[PDB]
Write a protein that binds this ligand. Structure first.
Ligand SMILES: CCCCCCC/C=C/CCCCCC(=O)OC[C@@H](O)CO
Ligand SMILES: CCCCCCC/C=C\CCCCCC(=O)OC[C@H](O)CO
Ligand SMILES: CCCCCCC/C=C\CCCCCC(=O)OC[C@H](O)CO
Ligand SMILES: CCCCCCC/C=C\CCCCCC(=O)OC[C@H](O)CO
Ligand SMILES: CCCCCCC/C=C\CCCCCC(=O)OC[C@H](O)CO
Ligand SMILES: CCCCCCC/C=C\CCCCCC(=O)OC[C@H](O)CO
Ligand SMILES: CCCCCCC/C=C\CCCCCC(=O)OC[C@H](O)CO
Ligand SMILES: CCCCCCC/C=C\CCCCCC(=O)OC[C@H](O)CO
Ligand SMILES: CCCCCCC/C=C\CCCCCC(=O)OC[C@H](O)CO
Ligand SMILES: CCCCCCC/C=C\CCCCCC(=O)OC[C@H](O)CO
Ligand SMILES: CCCCCCC/C=C\CCCCCC(=O)OC[C@H](O)CO
Ligand SMILES: CCCCCCC/C=C\CCCCCC(=O)OC[C@H](O)CO
Ligand SMILES: CCCCCCC/C=C\CCCCCC(=O)OC[C@H](O)CO
Ligand SMILES: NC(=O)CC[C@H](N)C(=O)O
Length: 437
């Protein structure tokens, strides 16, 4: 009695993540349009460009939080409590948007989810690994099934939440996200006590006595430095929302710079950059492509948010092939290059409808279908150890930090140039990074 060849525990963690991803990507699929709505009612006094920037820096902070989430669980509170309380915080974040409020609830929701996802996401991934011995070949297959589940939740969420939004409004749809996380907590809590090892109720690598003080010092100085900067910003009149997003952008990008300066490994640099650039493009699906979907495609007969299901749809379709592919077959730097090339191609493709049909009309949904087909093909060359997982979340974070700057450039007037430039740039950088490495 297994779960697709794996210990029954995989099913628990599988569904936990699926429902977490459900709530996250359900919310993500309507959050931009929601902000558009708040803007249209004079409730939110920002440009659409800034709204787009918010989406990206939101994702960036979510991934940055995940970069330290593993650390907190492994050394302070434990992997199993981190997932649980992480889940609770996420649930609360969605509940906040379900409440009959407007723009004033946005920040609180974002904070809870950043902290919550930071606690949950790296650590459920950790718990998957705990289901096996250090020497078991199923480890790869098991984690592959796990990722299939992550995308299963990401697939159905925009369909369900998107349609719900169109039926009963935004707050009801957001509450469905909350309910989804609640389901995940149920399956995780009761299922976990039966499948998961109890040694992960506590930190497996607790802070040694002499480690606590210098850690505390470094956190204090960092937080103090950050706050001092914000003070200065408010004194000199740089306190607009983009100002804060720029601050966050700089912080997120500075982190690998000083983190890589620390070990300087120089072979890791092009790998990191390729990942950063790939995730930048991939994460623009929920922002730039979401915008294209709403403005440049006729979605008069279906929720336009449904386009967000295409990304994880292709993960699920490619998984059977690529599984067989690896059984029946490329260097790590090669995989990243070709992957980034596909990402670039996915944007070059998106440049065609505007150049061929103009930008003032509407084009076939198949353009976005083909685009996601291309970038997810690239993800297959990138997508599937506490330390490496951290670099993974970090690369994702920097990509979205970059997006926070980049997506503000996107509009109907700049559409073709935007997709062409960053599309061809990514293809070229793909070529450069494969030979540089
Ligand atoms: C088939 C799956 C293989 C994965 C890679 C495929 C990527 C290829 C994408 C090209 C398709 C995009 C073109 C869509 C298109 O032009 O249709 C527009 C319109 O004519 C349809 O009515
Ligand atoms: C894991 C470390 C993260 C450190 C930063 C903590 C979170 C800081 C900012 C959250 C990023 C969201 C900025 C956009 C935003 O707040 O929008 C608010 C609404 O527009 C209300 O006007
Ligand atoms: C366990 C360590 C981290 C603790 C996480 C606590 C998160 C800190 C602040 C989140 C702010 C949540 C309150 C915001 C809120 O409720 O929305 C505002 C009103 O509902 C809108 O009128
Ligand atoms: C302890 C688990 C909590 C999970 C339940 C979260 C959702 C709970 C109740 C649903 C709240 C739905 C709000 C409905 C609402 O805001 O009115 C709808 C619009 O304002 C007008 O159509
Ligand atoms: C306003 C929402 C607040 C909800 C608080 C509910 C708290 C109820 C019980 C606390 C249980 C916390 C421990 C759960 C945990 O560590 O997960 C491990 C479980 O053994 C299953 O893996
Ligand atoms: C607003 C954030 C400012 C930065 C937070 C800095 C302070 C955060 C946590 C302080 C933790 C208390 C240090 C003492 C300690 O952890 O010992 C507890 C051990 O478990 C004792 O056995
Ligand atoms: C550990 C729980 C408390 C930690 C979170 C408290 C708030 C933390 C940082 C505040 C946000 C810092 C970046 C500024 C920012 O996001 O802008 C927010 C919007 O400008 C709101 O108007
Ligand atoms: C150990 C990593 C820490 C590195 C932190 C580096 C932060 C250095 C400078 C941050 C300056 C904040 C930028 C503020 C800003 O861009 O405001 C400009 C606004 O766009 C004007 O409206
Ligand atoms: C080796 C020492 C050098 C430290 C490297 C830190 C990296 C600093 C900045 C990264 C560039 C991203 C800034 C983009 C940005 O936020 O634009 C805002 C402008 O600063 C003002 O409009
Ligand atoms: C596994 C089978 C389910 C496949 C359908 C998944 C649908 C998910 C998102 C749909 C997003 C909008 C795509 C619309 C579409 O493909 O129609 C294309 C028509 O040829 C339009 O002329
Ligand atoms: C393997 C399939 C990949 C398909 C993508 C390859 C597409 C190749 C080039 C697309 C770039 C077309 C841009 C056309 C263009 O820039 O028009 C300029 C006009 O002046 C519009 O402002
Ligand atoms: C695994 C490598 C992926 C290679 C992609 C294979 C497809 C190659 C080129 C497809 C280019 C699609 C351009 C769309 C196009 O030109 O048609 C325009 C519209 O159909 C007008 O009716
Ligand atoms: C990569 C070698 C290490 C040196 C890093 C120093 C510069 C760090 C990051 C460079 C990318 C900065 C992205 C910000 C950017 O492109 O701004 C775009 C505009 O601000 C859009 O408004
Ligand atoms: N970029 C990442 O690190 C994670 C993205 C992936 N789509 C997920 O939700 O798990």
């Amino acid at each position: 009695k297994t779960f697709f060849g794996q210990p029954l525990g995989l099913s628990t963690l599988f569904m936990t993540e699926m429902w977490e991803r459900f709530s996250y990507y359900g919310m993500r699929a309507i959050l931009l349009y929601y902000m558009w709505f708040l803007i249209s009612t004079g409730d939110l006094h920002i440009t659409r460009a800034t709204a787009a920037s918010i989406m990206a820096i939101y994702a960036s902070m979510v991934y940055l939080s995940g970069t330290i989430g593993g650390f907190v669980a492994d050394r302070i509170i434990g992997a199993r409590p981190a997932v649980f309380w992480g889940g609770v915080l996420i649930m609360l974040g969605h509940i906040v948007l379900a409440l009959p409020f407007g723009a004033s609830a946005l920040f609180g929701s974002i904070i809870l989810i950043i902290i919550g996802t930071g606690f949950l996401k790296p650590n459920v991934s950790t718990l998957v690994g705990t289901l096996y011995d250090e020497h078991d070949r199923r480890r790869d297959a098991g984690f592959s099934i796990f990722v299939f589940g992550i995308n299963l939740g990401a697939f159905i969420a925009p369909l369900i939440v998107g349609a719900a939004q169109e039926a009963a409004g935004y707050h009801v749809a957001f509450s469905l996200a909350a309910i989804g996380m609640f389901i995940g907590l149920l399956v995780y809590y009761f299922g976990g006590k039966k499948t998961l090892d109890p040694h992960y109720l506590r930190p497996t690598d607790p802070l040694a006595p002499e480690e606590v003080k210098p850690l505390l010092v470094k956190v204090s100085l960092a937080v103090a430095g950050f706050i001092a900067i914000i003070v200065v910003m408010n004194l000199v009149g740089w306190n607009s929302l983009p100002a804060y997003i720029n601050l966050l952008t700089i912080v997120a990008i500075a982190i690998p710079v000083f983190y890589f300066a620390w070990m300087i490994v120089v072979s890791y640099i092009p790998l990191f950059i390729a990942a950063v650039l790939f995730w930048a493009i991939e994460e623009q699906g929920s922002v730039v492509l979401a915008t294209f979907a709403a403005e440049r495609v006729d979605s008069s007969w279906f929720p336009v948010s449904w386009f967000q299901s295409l990304n994880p749809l292709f993960i699920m379709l490619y998984t059977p092939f690529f599984a067989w592919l690896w059984t029946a077959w490329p260097s790590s730097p090669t995989k990243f290059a070709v992957g980034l090339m596909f990402a670039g191609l996915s944007f070059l493709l998106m440049a065609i409808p505007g150049a061929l049909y103009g930008t003032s009309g509407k084009v076939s949904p198949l353009w976005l279908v083909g685009s996601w087909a291309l970038v997810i093909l690239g993800e297959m060359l990138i997508s599937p150890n506490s330390q490496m997982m951290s670099m993974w979340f970090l690369s994702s974070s920097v990509g979205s930090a970059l997006n926070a700057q980049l997506v503000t450039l996107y509009n109907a007037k700049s559409e073709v140039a935007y997709f062409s430039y960053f599309g061809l740039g990514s293809v070229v950088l793909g070529i450069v990074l494969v030979f540089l490495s």
